[PDB]
Amino acid sequence: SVLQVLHIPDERLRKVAKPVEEVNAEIQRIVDDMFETMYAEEGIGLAATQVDIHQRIIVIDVSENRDERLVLINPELLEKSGETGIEEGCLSIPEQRALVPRAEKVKIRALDRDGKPFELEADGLLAICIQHEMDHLVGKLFMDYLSPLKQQRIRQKVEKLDRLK
Ligand SMILES: [Fe+3]
DSSP, rough: OOOOOOSSGGGGGGOOOOSSOOOOOOHHHHHHHHHHHHHTTTTTTTEEEGGTBBEEEEEEOOTSSSSOEEEEEEEEEEEEEEBBBEOOOTTTTTTTTEEEBSSHHHHEEEEOOSSEEEEEOOOOOHHHHHHHHHHHHHHHOGGGGGGGHHHHHHHHHHHHHHHHH
């Protein structure tokens, strides 16, 4: 099922997700609905927080052919290095983009869809996407890195778009 993605302003986007206690059938079903939602909404990443499920679950697919499913359950950042930035967008901040500072490379550890631990080193777009999704799980959005004024304008623009429905 395609789930509803929350849009700012919405306080549920600021909630801190709790760790997943056990990767069971129910968690797998959430992972699956999150990928369905992410693809339907044309995204490359989605955090559970964005679909009002406050557990540490992230789905990502940054591949050209949309066939490389990465699942990050209970991810932990182990190392990071460098600095970089691209104009990021967000499914919860429709049609707004802004350059945000990010580490260029990251190394994380997480559980996959089977509950198996794995480590992943990433750079480029994937490193940026991982940081953006991990920020969502602790209630942080990319606009938070921008000036107060820019944040105001972003919020006002999204509210307008959503009013036009
Ligand atoms: Fe996002």
